[PDB]
Amino acid sequence: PITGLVYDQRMMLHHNMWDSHHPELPQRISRIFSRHEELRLLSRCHRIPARLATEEELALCHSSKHISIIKSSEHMKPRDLNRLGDEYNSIFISNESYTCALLAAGSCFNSAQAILTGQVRNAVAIVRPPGHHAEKDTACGFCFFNTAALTARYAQSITRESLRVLIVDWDVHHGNGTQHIFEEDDSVLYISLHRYEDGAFFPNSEDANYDKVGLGKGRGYNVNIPWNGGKMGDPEYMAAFHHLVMPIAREFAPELVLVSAGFDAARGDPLGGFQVTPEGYAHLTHQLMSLAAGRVLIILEGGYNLTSISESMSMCTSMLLGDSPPSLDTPLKTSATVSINNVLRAHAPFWSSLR
Ligand SMILES: O=C(NO)c1ccc(CN(Cc2cccnc2)S(=O)(=O)C2CCCC2)cc1
Ligand SMILES: [K+]
Ligand SMILES: [K+]
Ligand SMILES: [Zn+2]
């Protein structure tokens, strides 16, 4: 029952040349790593090395032109970095950004390989920049390449094309890129919980609503759980898992679970406005560990309170290592009941576990 951990300080080099306080900070990953040492988790893990994804591995999900554009930024002067970055929704670029995005993906590929070949049972990937907003053909929302989507395809490339991969995306934002990549795919089940606010919260698209269930043979394999009008936390996330995430995931019977684990829904996050606790994230991790024979890979996405993300992600690793889960409690906010029931009705036709 070995737990793997991948972290490489080099991923700190991606930075914002124009705003030292921009929340997607280099030290997001170093602080999470430090907390693993401070709590004596690091020495309990098997250290998986980082590596660069290849351009051909990026082609598992991304266009040749998109790869070339981000690749070219390694050599741009600040004026061109500014202008290129501004062509996307919510992107800053430095000369190190391409290499950091390659390291984040390659790290996750090595973690998936270690799990699927039985070298470790589960793993955590402390990586930046994030991935879940990146589309096949564009960067978006701090993300250059879709690390989680690429890891699902990489996992399939080294196993079989029909490998059943579950992606649970608990970042406070909808993973538009991940949804779109797998929207017509019945081999990758995408489940997102996210603040939505009737389309008003980033990334500001009705694609994140509950009635988007997938397309074609993918119908039923895209599960959006959108929150509106409330400061959601442990009660609402635990109820979403109990009524939705776990029954669906158990019926799907994945062979590999990837977590797009942003910690921006955490209590204390300056952007998310939510109040999930570190014990709440530990609960969610422990629930997912009952799937896929425990084959869970936790991939950092967003999360901007350094203290909050460090404690939260460390608690997830504690669960992966087999430590006893914390006990949690307790009325939901009323709009969360509405949201959950809206998803249930959208997905009851496709999942017998919901009937
Ligand atoms: O975490 C993420 N994804 O997983 C994430 C992705 C993108 C952003 C960008 N921001 C939007 C925002 C603000 C508050 C809360 N959520 C999102 S923004 O910086 O304000 C940008 C908008 C237009 C001008 C600046 C932030 C987080
Ligand atoms: K999400
Ligand atoms: K899908
Ligand atoms: Zn986010």
Q: Which amino acid is at 115?
A: I
Could you check whether the bond before residue 235 is cis, i.e. omega within 30 degrees of 0?
A: no
Distance (Å) from CA 278 to ligand 3 centroid = 28
Which candidate, 12, 2, 1, places its Cα nearest to that of 300? 12
* Beta-bridge partners for 167: 190, 258
Which candidate, 32, 29, 36, places its Cα nearest to that of 13? 29
Opening angle at CA 291, ends 285 and 297, nearest 5: 55
The number of domains in the chain is 1
Q: How far apart are CA 347 and CA 355, in angstroms?
A: 9
For residues 259, 264, 266, 268, the Cα torsion angle rounded to the nearest 10 degrees is 160
Q: What's the token pair of residue 32?
A: 């999470």
Question: Which ligand is the nearest neighbour of the Cα of 195?
Answer: 2
Q: Sort 207 into a burial class: Cβ within 10 Å, 0-12 / 13-18 / 19+.
A: middle
Orientation angle between helical segments 278-288 and 306-320, nearest 10 degrees: 30
Q: Which amino acid is at 62?
A: H
Opening angle at CA 34, ends 166 and 10, nearest 5: 75
Q: What's the token pair of residue 17?
A: 């040349």
Which candidate, 98, 99, 105, places its Cα nearest to that of 84? 98
Instruction: State phi, psi for 137 to the nearest 5 degrees.
Output: -115, 10
Contact 173 CB / ligand 1 (< 6 Å)? yes
Q: How far apart are CA 102 and CA 72, in angstroms?
A: 13
Q: How far apart are CA 105 and CA 103, in angstroms?
A: 5
Q: Which residues contact 256 (CB under 8 A, 6 or more apart)?
A: 112, 115, 116, 152, 155, 163, 164, 165, 166, 292, 295, 297
Opening angle at CA 59, ends 58 and 63, nearest 5: 110
Q: How far apart are CA 319 and CA 326, in angstroms?
A: 9
Distance (Å) from CA 272 to ligand 1 centroid = 9
Q: How was this structure determined?
A: X-ray
* Beta-bridge partners for 143: 140
What is the CATH number for 260? 3.40.800.20
Tell me if 321 sits within 8 A of 44, measured CB to CB: yes
Q: How far apart are CA 10 and CA 162, in angstroms?
A: 34
Contact 182 CB / ligand 1 (< 6 Å)? no
Q: What is the resolution of this structure in A?
A: 1.3
The answer to whether 36 is annotated as binding is no
Contact 89 CB / ligand 1 (< 6 Å)? no
Ramachandran bin of 214, using left for φ above 0, alpha for ψ from -120 to 50, beta for the remaining angles: left
Q: What's the token pair of residue 236?
A: 């609402």
Interruption sites in the chain after residues (C→N beyond 2.5 Å)? 329
Output 178-182 pairs: Cβ under 8 A, ≥24 positions apart.
178/132, 178/146, 178/148, 178/149, 178/260, 179/207, 179/208, 179/212, 179/222, 179/224, 180/135, 180/136, 180/207, 181/61, 181/135, 181/136, 181/146, 181/149, 182/149, 182/152, 182/218, 182/221, 182/222
Domain extent at residue 104: 1-355
Q: Which residues contact 43 (CB under 8 A, 6 or more apart)?
A: none
